[PDB]
């Protein structure tokens, strides 16, 4: 599974 990030803002 990819390393994920939350959307910026």
């Amino acid at each position, epitope marked *: 599974a990819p390393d994920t990030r*939350p959307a*910026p*803002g």
Partner: antibody
Amino acid sequence: QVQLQQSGAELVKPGASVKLSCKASGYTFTNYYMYWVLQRPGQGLEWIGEINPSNGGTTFNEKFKNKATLTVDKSSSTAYMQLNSLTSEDSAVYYCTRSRYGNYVNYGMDYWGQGTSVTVSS
Amino acid sequence: DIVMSQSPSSLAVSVGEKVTMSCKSSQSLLYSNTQKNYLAWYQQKPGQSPKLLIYWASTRESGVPDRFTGSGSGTDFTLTISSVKAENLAVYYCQQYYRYPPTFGGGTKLELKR
């Protein structure tokens, strides 16, 4: 329209610090992760780290843990990178770059600053 | 780190040739059954910053001619320029964003045959 303006070239002694800047215009700053990338002379590209300009959170490459500090001034749309304990190994062009976000990742660095030459010699 | 291997490092071409360059990855960049591959291609001409061409292995950044074609899946990817022009002479880097740190390949430099 979309523009990343990096600060002037740098010439410093070993053990010094530089604080590079990267003024962003033409888009909502806080809606894109900002990546920093270096290119040693005559070499490939290496990722340094990211900053989320909306909260200032960061992640670095293991190799730059103690080397780099990333920050932003939201009111001026400027990303900053500070380098510490400079050796001549750190002479390179340093880029700031906007990444696009989607499917929970940063999938493409679509706008780049012109780069900032840092030269470290005694 | 994921290691991105580009072959060959250097490639001599003629204006008008079809040109394929290769990019291999030490882990699969394909996520599950999504059919999405977490790979991008960049171009760098000398004394300039890199330019994004392709992301998700095969999707072209806007304003990039369809003369550029990304493909492959899992670990083995290619970039193809269907009809090389002089303005296409550059280094091409591949780059995975499946895992942190994001990592680039070593580049493939396009030069002119004579």
